[PDB]
Design a protein around this ligand. Structure first.
Ligand SMILES: *[C@@H]1O[C@H](CO)[C@@H](O[C@@H]2O[C@H](CO)[C@@H](O[C@@H]3O[C@H](CO)[C@@H](O[C@H]4O[C@H](CO)[C@@H](O)[C@H](O[C@H]5O[C@H](CO)[C@@H](O)[C@H](O)[C@@H]5O)[C@@H]4O)[C@H](O)[C@@H]3O)[C@H](O)[C@H]2NC(C)=O)[C@H](O)[C@H]1NC(C)=O
Ligand SMILES: *[C@@H]1O[C@H](CO)[C@@H](O[C@@H]2O[C@H](CO)[C@@H](O[C@@H]3O[C@H](CO)[C@@H](O[C@H]4O[C@H](CO)[C@@H](O)[C@H](O)[C@@H]4O)[C@H](O)[C@@H]3O)[C@H](O)[C@H]2NC(C)=O)[C@H](O)[C@H]1NC(C)=O
Ligand SMILES: *[C@@H]1O[C@H](CO)[C@@H](O[C@@H]2O[C@H](CO)[C@@H](O[C@@H]3O[C@H](CO)[C@@H](O)[C@H](O)[C@@H]3O)[C@H](O)[C@H]2NC(C)=O)[C@H](O)[C@H]1NC(C)=O
Ligand SMILES: *[C@@H]1O[C@H](CO)[C@@H](O[C@@H]2O[C@H](CO)[C@@H](O)[C@H](O)[C@H]2NC(C)=O)[C@H](O)[C@H]1NC(C)=O
Ligand SMILES: *[C@@H]1O[C@H](CO)[C@@H](O[C@@H]2O[C@H](CO)[C@@H](O)[C@H](O)[C@H]2NC(C)=O)[C@H](O)[C@H]1NC(C)=O
Ligand SMILES: *[C@@H]1O[C@H](CO)[C@@H](O[C@@H]2O[C@H](CO)[C@@H](O)[C@H](O)[C@H]2NC(C)=O)[C@H](O)[C@H]1NC(C)=O
Ligand SMILES: [Fe+3]
Ligand SMILES: [Fe+3]
Lengths: 348, 348
């Protein structure tokens, strides 16, 4: 138990992880499963040590006994002097994104509309919007709010997966990993852009990164960010530049989780793996780049500078925050998770 | 599914249930329908979990296999050293009410007069009076005993709905929910207090709470209990103070019902929701008051202290009393309702 076993979600993340493994000199090793839930189970079983997770998936990890180790830190706005690994994290902005053309679409008219989600149980994709919808309507029938959606991880037969497109061969529709066309921050924005859905629940950063020649890929090549607007809670629409006052909520940053008996080991190993393969480390881009992907947002968000430290060994609760923990728990009163039920049974 | 789905009857109850959901953090959720019967269908099919029913409606729910969970308890007449939840449940007094200026009018000259009813199938408004009238005239022809009525829930083409006024714009005449200005205890009494009717079938408490400056509603603002008499079975009229000597019968109190499989979960959640939002709850009146209405008697009677444990898991027969069940059963021999016929096979 000196090798750190990384859990990779789907085959695209498996490739990057294999590459990482070789260059690490087996200091880091790979297990795979097809979903993040499946990977959380591997860590519980001891068939893997760690992966990097959306705050939403950190809630599942936490309820099953896992702890946060290090957080994603992206480019800040100020305090450039302090070292990235010591520089306090900020936390992204969950926004609802429409095409300006879609006329008279506000927060207050989303009922019966078409939705694109990162995946079920992710913070910007699901917890935040569906938390607010459920609370506003006083109804747990979130599964019938949108006429149709692509929400990878949902029931593949339901209206919540109706819009999902699968891989190149239209196969594995709605499976929550990179191979599904509309999976993730990128996939959900691409679902809005190809006008398959009226609204997309992503983070502010995703909107910028795939408009005004900022991404090479074709679906996003010619996209211009005056053709997109942000929905605000009050009802108003605002330009994508207004996210600071037209966001649904502030999300905690994606973080690495492991068993509590492996945190310190995983911490120490990953700091060293960063100094090697991070943004400004000895062997990027010479050998291998840990925070860059052949496709997009594999193991870590491409927008990641470093993995940063946390204050005083925090619980998943302390990490995510009292308020976002109450919102998730409240939304989850409307659903049943076999994973959470198992974990309640075998952590009591 | 930890959420309890409450069934609100009509849009005024829906607004109160949405508030309740929000302040309970989705410990409670709202389904709605236009009528109590429709809501009993929702609970049967598991689309809703519970609602608070008049004893007449508890008989319909019981025949369709639902069980009583908790009973409404009002401020006792005597001294109770016990907590409201454990204090015994008294029962309310079913009375006939008239203007005193209606000379000649007794129990014995009711035939061919104008009646106001809380609604069809309710204990005081309907099962008590009409049961005695079918018994006493020896005829099933109770639909023609009064010349005209408001009895919300009856055939809106028949004379039983002739006097019903509906809502602001007189839409939804005779629908058995609070949009109908003459619906329920409040509505039946307002019907007598604007001389649309000659007799109103309500409970003792209804007259007190709406006479002698004791409500803010304009139709009631300037009512005097001296202007009203009570009809007794002996043929005499007495004042509203003689309710104990001048009542048609004793009604079992309104009670929450659910399916047998959700009863324990619904009991646990409600006992805790009234600790928070009941008469002496931490969060009433700052956040939400479970037993107050913007209008009147929404979800619960506004004169409800707490909801109170029953005996050991009773049935609808045990809760209602063999005497009332047989009085109801004999009145239903003269009539058919869809829900009783649909469910008849369950207990035959
Ligand atoms: C018909 O309908 C009507 C429904 O409105 C009924 O009228 C209502 O009846 C009740 C009484 O039956 C009234 O409510 C009472 O209000 C008093 C205070 O105003 C309240 O408190 C006293 O009662 C007992 C006495 O034992 C105790 O709980 C209290 O004692 C405590 O406090 C004192 C000091 O202040 C201490 O010394 C003691 O040691 C105790 O700590 C009080 O003395 C009553 O409990 C009760 O709620 C309603 O006001 C009245 N409603 C209206 C609007 O008029 C009527 O009963 C119905 N009739 C029938 C036959 O059912
Ligand atoms: C929404 O999402 C966007 C992410 O895609 C955010 O836009 C980015 O925001 C930062 C602004 O804080 C941009 O980073 C910049 O990068 C510069 C270097 O290339 C920085 O350094 C320069 O400026 C200062 C001078 O004071 C010094 O650090 C240094 O001397 C240097 O000259 C800039 O300071 C700046 O941070 C980033 O490029 C933006 N990305 C894109 C593609 O536009 C946006 O902030 C997010 N919105 C909210 C409200 O959070
Ligand atoms: C929504 O429902 C839940 C019920 O699931 C309420 O929270 C629960 O409330 C109980 C009793 O208040 C809590 O128990 C307390 O916890 C501590 C620590 O265990 C204990 O020592 C105390 O004596 C007390 O019993 C319980 O923790 C909690 N349960 C869960 C699952 O969170 C909540 O209050 C309800 N919210 C609203 C707004 O109604
Ligand atoms: C793999 O892990 C070990 C850390 O345990 C690294 O080995 C150390 O390397 C430095 C010089 O690079 C030595 O001075 C240390 O004494 C070594 N420690 C041990 C225990 O061998 C190694 O660098 C790592 N390799 C990669 C590719 O990350
Ligand atoms: C659920 O929604 C309601 C309103 O839509 C929120 O409750 C309001 O919040 C304010 C500020 O905290 C309270 O003071 C008001 O009393 C509430 N208004 C109403 C109409 O109830 C509630 O906080 C939301 N819950 C969550 C978790 O966001
Ligand atoms: C009216 O109701 C009375 C009861 O209030 C009925 O008389 C009872 O009938 C039962 C069986 O049918 C007898 O066993 C009891 O002895 C009677 N009770 C009393 C108190 O006398 C009567 O059948 C009803 N009559 C009509 C015409 O409906
Ligand atoms: Fe996220
Ligand atoms: Fe009643």
């Amino acid at each position: 138990y000196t090798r750190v076993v990384w859990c990779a979600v789907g085959p695209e993340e498996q490739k990057k992880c294999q590459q990482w493994s070789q260059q690490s000199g087996q200091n880091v090793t790979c297990a795979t499963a097809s979903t993040t839930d499946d990977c959380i189970v591997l860590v519980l079983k001891g068939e893997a040590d760690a992966l990097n997770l959306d705050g939403g998936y950190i809630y599942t990890a936490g309820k099953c006994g896992l702890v946060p180790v290090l957080a994603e830190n992206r480019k800040s706005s100020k305090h450039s002097s302090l070292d990235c690994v010591l520089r306090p994290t900020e936390g992204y902005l969950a926004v609802a994104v429409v095409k300006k053309a879609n006329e008279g679409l506000t927060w207050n008219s989303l009922k019966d509309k078409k939705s694109c989600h990162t995946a079920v149980d992710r913070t910007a994709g699901w917890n935040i919007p569906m938390g607010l919808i459920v609370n506003q309507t006083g109804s747990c029938a979130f599964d019938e709010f949108f006429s149709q959606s692509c929400a990878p991880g949902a029931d593949p037969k339901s209206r919540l997966c109706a819009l999902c497109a699968g891989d190149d061969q239209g196969l594995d529709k709605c499976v929550p990993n990179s191979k599904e066309k509309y999976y993730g921050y990128t996939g959900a924005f691409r679902c809005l852009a190809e006008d398959v859905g009226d609204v997309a629940f992503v983070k502010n950063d995703t909107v910028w990164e795939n408009t005004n020649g900022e991404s090479t890929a074709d679906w996003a090549k010619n996209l211009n960010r005056e053709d997109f607007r942000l929905l605000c809670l009050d009802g108003t629409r605002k330009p994508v530049t207004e996210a600071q006052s037209c966001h649904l909520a502030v999300a905690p940053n994606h973080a690495v989780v492991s068993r509590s008996d492996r945190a310190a080991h995983v911490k120490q190993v990953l700091l060293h793996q960063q100094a090697l393969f991070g943004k400004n480390g000895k062997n990027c881009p010479d050998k291998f780049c840990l925070f860059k992907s052949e496709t997009k947002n594999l193991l870590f968000n491409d927008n990641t500078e470093c993995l940063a430290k946390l204050g005083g060994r925090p619980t998943y609760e302390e990490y995510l925050g009292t308020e976002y923990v109450t919102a998730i728990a409240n939304l989850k009163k409307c659903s049943t998770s076999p994973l959470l039920e198992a974990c309640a049974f075998l952590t009591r």
